[PDB]
Design an enzyme around this catalytic site. Structure first.
Site, PDB file in Angstrom:
ATOM      1  CB  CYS B 108     -36.528  53.676  66.400  1.00 45.31           C
ATOM      2  SG  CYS B 108     -35.382  53.061  65.076  1.00 45.31           S
ATOM      3  CD1 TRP B 280     -32.603  50.582  56.093  1.00 46.33           C
ATOM      4  CD2 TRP B 280     -30.442  50.622  56.752  1.00 46.33           C
ATOM      5  NE1 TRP B 280     -32.364  49.447  56.831  1.00 46.33           N
ATOM      6  CE2 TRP B 280     -31.054  49.443  57.244  1.00 46.33           C
ATOM      7  CE3 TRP B 280     -29.077  50.851  57.026  1.00 46.33           C
ATOM      8  CZ2 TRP B 280     -30.348  48.495  58.017  1.00 46.33           C
ATOM      9  CZ3 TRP B 280     -28.378  49.909  57.792  1.00 46.33           C
ATOM     10  CH2 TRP B 280     -29.012  48.737  58.255  1.00 46.33           C
TER      11      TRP B 280
END
Ligand code: HEM
Ligand code: HEM
Ligand code: X2D
Ligand code: X2D
Ligand code: H4B
Ligand code: H4B
Ligand code: ZN
Lengths: 409, 411
Positions: B108, B280
C-alpha cells in the site's frame, strides 16, 4: 519444489522445474524478500565440483551424456586441476558457457536472442594494447554500420586473483561528466568519478557534454592504461522528433552500441573478469533512464517547457507527456539513421515468447520482474502481468565492484 | 541484525531493524525469490502466543508495557481462551489493530495516512440485512459528498470457520460484466463470474456498460443475500478530458470510492473475514489498470483511433500516448467534480517521506516494490529508485479465496 507461474492477463499457467537445478543464493529468506535490492581465489576442492557440474551440462547439451568422450574430458580436467590448480576450457565449452551465461541472465529482457552470440576468444591476450585491439574489433563487428550483432569478447581467466584482466569502464562507450564551479554537472553525472580518474591518468578532456570516454584497460593485474576508441568506430545518433522541429535544438545525441564491460563471467568455476558484451538498445533505457533520471541528463523540465505544458501541478501529468515524446524521438532517430533499436512493446512481447519456449524446452526461465518490466508504461506491456521466478543458474554473469575502489597501484 | 536499503537517486541509505519482528513466511527461499508471485480454525495452542504478542505490542504503543492494566488484560485473555477457545478484543485494541494492519500492509502506497482511519465496530451484527445497513453507513461516511475519508467496518470474527461473515463482492462498489454469446464482454470483464452469481441469486441486471453490482452478503455462515446499494449513495464521476472534447462521448465514468471488501484482517490471532475498508483512488488504478488492461475495459485502441495516432507500429508509442491522455482525463474529471484523488507523482513522493519517517521511528517499513511502483511512468517516480524490504508483520490484511469456491450451500 514444483512451482507454478501464472500470467494474470492471459491465465496461462507454466510449471517451473528448472529452479531445482539452481545453486547460488538469492539474498531472500523465508522472513525477508530482497527482490528490489540491486546488490542482495577458488581452491582445488571448490573447483572440481564446479567443473563437473558444467561439463555434465555441456555433454548433456550435445547428447553425449555419459559417453566415453564425456568421461574422458571429466578425467582430463580433474588431472589438470590437481596438477595445475586450474584448467582451460575447450573452444566449444567456452562458446557454450558464454551463450548460457546470457541464457541465465535473469535481468535480461532480450534473451530470445541468446543462441545468436558471436564469441571472440581473447584468452591469448597479454597486454592492454592487445586488449584495446580486441575491443576495437569487437566494437566494429558488433556495430556493423548500424545493423547490430550480439557479441562478447573474453579475456584471460583469473589465476591467483592478483593478475586480473579488467576493463575499468562500466560500458565500452559512455559520455564524460565534470563538476563545474557553477555547482552543476556538465555531461553525464554518472561518470564524474571515472572521468576524474581518466584525467588524473592523463586524458585531456574536451571539456564537453557528450565526450566519448577513453578506455582504461588493466591487463594482468598491472596499473591500467588509457586508449581512445577510434572516433570513427563509435556510431552516434543525433536525437530529433518526427513532429517537434525544436527537438533537435536540445542538441541531444546517444551512442548506438550498448556494451557492458564490468561484469564477471563464471563458467565451470572459472572466472573471466574482463568479458565485455553487447547487443542493442531497448529504447526506454536511453529515453527514460539516461535522459530523464533525476541524477542523469535530467531533461524532463527543458522538454516540458518547450512543449508549453502546465508545469504548475504534478496532476497535469506534464512529466508523463514529455516522457513519451522523448521516447518517441529516441526510437524515431535510431530508426531513421538505420541503427538497430527495439521498443519496449516489441522487446517484452518477444520475451514472453522466449519464456514460453524456455518453459516447454527447458522447464523454466529465471526472470527478475523488477528489471524486466520497462521503466515506463509497465502495465501496458505483457511482462507486467507475468509472474516470474528469480533464481541463479550457472554459467552466469555477476556484477563486480568498480576496480579503482580495490586495485593497488 | 541490521539490513540496509539504498536510494539510487539520492544515495540515502536506511537501516532496517523492524524485520526482526517478522513472523510469517514470504514465499521466497535462499534459492528462489517469489517477489512477483501474486499469491506466494486455530487451536488454543497457537492462539495465546499470538494474543500475547499483540497485547504486548498494544501495551508498548500506549506506554503501559508491564503495567497492572497490561498484566490484568493478559490474565483475562488467557482465561477467556482456555474457557471459550477464543477471546474478544476491547474497542481500543480493535482500533489500534486495524490501523496497524494498514500500517503493516507492504503493498500500500497510501500508508502516510495510516493513523487516520475511521473504525466502525460492527461486531454486534448478526444478519445480512444488518451487514447491508452497516455497509451503507460506511459508504455514506467515507464518500462524504466527494471529500473522501478513510474507513473500515469490522464484522464478527471467525469462530469454527463454519459461521464466517463474508462480503462476496471483492469491492463494495464495482461494475457488472456480461459475457456475450459472440465472446465480447459488456461492462467489466473482471466481474463476469460474480455478475453471473448475482443474476443466479435473483438480481435483475440492467445489462449496460456501467451497472453498479448488488451487494452479496453472508452472515454467520449462512447463504449470502442480495442487496442493492441505494444509488444516491454511489458517487460517480463522468470522465472527460480538459483539451479533447470527444473524450466525453466515449461514455466513460467511474465510481469515486475504492472499497476493498475481500480481505481477512488478523489481529492478535483473531480472524475478521469481513472487514471492508476504503480510502481514495490513485488515478493510475482507474486510468492505467481499469481502463487500459487488455482484460478490462481495454480502451487504448478507441482512444488512439480518435487521437489519430499512427497505429501501424508499436514504435510510434501510440499506446503510451493514449495512456497518458486517459490518465490526464481521470484526474481532471475527479478534480473538477471535487472528488478526492491523488496522482501517482504526489502519492509516491508522500510514500517516500512516510517510509523514511517509519525507518526513523519504527526501525523500518516493509514495502513490496512490485506493487508500490505505479503501472505507468515507473522510473520518473521516486519509488522506482528506492530499495525496499518486504516482510510480514501482524496485525495484517491477507488475501482470501473467493467464497463461492469454498461455501457450503445450505439451500
Ligand atoms: C541483443 C539485444 C539485447 C537486448 C535488447 C537486451 C536487453 C537488456 C536490458 C534492457 C537490460 C537492462 C539493462 C539495464 O537496465 O541497465 C539488460 C540487462 C542485462 N543483460 Fe541484456 N540485452 C541484449 C543483449 C545481451 C547480451 C548479448 C548479453 C550477454 C551476453 C546480455 C546480458 C545481460 C546482463 C548480464 C544484464 C544485467 C546487467 C547488470 O546487472 O547491470 N544481454 N538486457
Ligand atoms: C487512503 C488512501 C489510499 C490510497 C491512495 C491507497 C493506495 C493503494 C493502492 C494504489 C494500492 C494498490 C491497489 C491495487 O493495485 O489493487 C493499495 C493496496 C492496498 N492497501 Fe491502500 N491506499 C489507501 C488506503 C488504504 C486503507 C484505508 C487500507 C486499509 C485500512 C489500505 C490497505 C491496503 C491493502 C491491504 C492493500 C493490498 C491490497 C491487495 O492485496 O489487494 N489502503 N493501496
Ligand atoms: C549497482 C549495479 C548493479 C548491476 N547489476 N548493474 C548496474 C548497472 C546499472 C543497472 N542498470 C542501469 C545501469 O546499467 C547501465 C548499463 N545498461 C546496459 C547497457 C544497457 C544494455 C541494453 C541492451 C543490451 C545490453 Cl548488452 C546492454 C549497477
Ligand atoms: C489474486 C489477488 C491477490 C491480491 N492480494 N489482490 C488481488 C486484487 C487485485 C490487486 N490489484 C488489482 C485487483 O485489485 C482491485 C482493487 N484495488 C483496490 C481498489 C484499490 C484501492 C485504491 C486506493 C485505496 C484503496 Cl482502500 C483501494 C488479487
Ligand atoms: C531499487 C530498484 O531495484 C532499482 O531502482 C532498479 C529497479 N529496476 C531496474 N530495472 C532495470 N532494467 N535497470 C535498473 O537499473 C533498475 N533499477
Ligand atoms: C505478476 C505481477 O506480480 C502482477 O501483475 C502485479 C504486478 N504489480 C501490481 N501492482 C499493483 N498495485 N497491483 C497489481 O495488481 C499488480 N499486479
Ligand atoms: Zn524474494
Amino acid at each position: 519444489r514444483f512451482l507454478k507461474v501464472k500470467n494474470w492477463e492471459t491465465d496461462v499457467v507454466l510449471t517451473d522445474t528448472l529452479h531445482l537445478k539452481s545453486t547460488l543464493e538469492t539474498g531472500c529468506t523465508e522472513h525477508i524478500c530482497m527482490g528490489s535490492i540491486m546488490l542482495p581465489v577458488r581452491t582445488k576442492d571448490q573447483l572440481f565440483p564446479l567443473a563437473k557440474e558444467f561439463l555434465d551440462q555441456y555433454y548433456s547439451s550435445i547428447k553425449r551424456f555419459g559417453s566415453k568422450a564425456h568421461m574422458d574430458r571429466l578425467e582430463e580436467v580433474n588431472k589438470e586441476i590437481e596438477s595445475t590448480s586450474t584448467y582451460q576450457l575447450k573452444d566449444t565449452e567456452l562458446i557454450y558457457g558464454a551463450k548460457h551465461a546470457w541464457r541465465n541472465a535473469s535481468r535480461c529482457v532480450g534473451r530470445i536472442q541468446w543462441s545468436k552470440l558471436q564469441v571472440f576468444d581473447a584468452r591469448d591476450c597479454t597486454t592492454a594494447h592487445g586488449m584495446f585491439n580486441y575491443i576495437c574489433n569487437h566494437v566494429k563487428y558488433a556495430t556493423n554500420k548500424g545493423n547490430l550483432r550480439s557479441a562478447i569478447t573474453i579475456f584471460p581467466q583469473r589465476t591467483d586473483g592478483k593478475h586480473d584482466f579488467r576493463v575499468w569502464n562500466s560500458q565500452l562507450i559512455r559520455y564524460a561528466g565534470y563538476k563545474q564551479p557553477d555547482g552543476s554537472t556538465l555531461g553525464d553525472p554518472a561518470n564524474v568519478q571515472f572521468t576524474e580518474i581518466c584525467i588524473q591518468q592523463g586524458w585531456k578532456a574536451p571539456r564537453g557534454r557528450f565526450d566519448v570516454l577513453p578506455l582504461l584497460l588493466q591487463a594482468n593485474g598491472n596499473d591500467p592504461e588509457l586508449f581512445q576508441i577510434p572516433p570513427e568506430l563509435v556510431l552516434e545518433v543525433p536525437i530529433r522528433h518526427p513532429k517537434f522541429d525544436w527537438f533537435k535544438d536540445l542538441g541531444l545525441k546517444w551512442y548506438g552500441l550498448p556494451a557492458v564491460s564490468n561484469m564477471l563471467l563464471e563458467i565451470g568455476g572459472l572466472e573471466f573478469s574482463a568479458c565485455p558484451f553487447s547487443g542493442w538498445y531497448m529504447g526506454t533505457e536511453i529515453g527514460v533512464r539516461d535522459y530523464c533520471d533525476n541524477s542523469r541528463y535530467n531533461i524532463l523540465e527543458e522538454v516540458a517547457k518547450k512543449m508549453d505544458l502546465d508545469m504548475r501541478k504534478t496532476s497535469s501529468l506534464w512529466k508523463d507527456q514529455a516522457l513519451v515524446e522523448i521516447n518517441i524521438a529516441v526510437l524515431y532517430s535510431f530508426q531513421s539513421d538505420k541503427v538497430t533499436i527495439v521498443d519496449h512493446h516489441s522487446a517484452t512481447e518477444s520475451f514472453i515468447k522466449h519464456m514460453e519456449n524456455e518453459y516447454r524446452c527447458r522447464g523454466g526461465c529465471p526472470a527478475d520482474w523488477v528489471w524486466i518490466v520497462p521503466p515506463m508504461s509497465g502495465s501496458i506491456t505483457p511482462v507486467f502481468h507475468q509472474e516470474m521466478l528469480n533464481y541463479r543458474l550457472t554459467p552466469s554473469f555477476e556484477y563486480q565492484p568498480d576496480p579503482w575502489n580495490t586495485h593497488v597501484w
